[PDB]
Amino acid sequence: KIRTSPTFRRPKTLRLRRQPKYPRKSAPRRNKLDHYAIIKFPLTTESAMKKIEDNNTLV
RNA sequence: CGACUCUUAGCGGUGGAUCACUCGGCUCGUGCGUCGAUGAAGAACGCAGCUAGCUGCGAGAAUUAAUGUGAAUUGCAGGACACAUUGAUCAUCGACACUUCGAACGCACUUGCGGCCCCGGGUUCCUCCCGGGGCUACGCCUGUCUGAGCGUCGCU
Question: What does the comment on domains in this protein's record state?
Answer without folding.
Answer: The N-terminal beta-like import receptor binding (BIB) domain mediates interaction with IPO5, IPO7, KPNB1 and TNPO1.
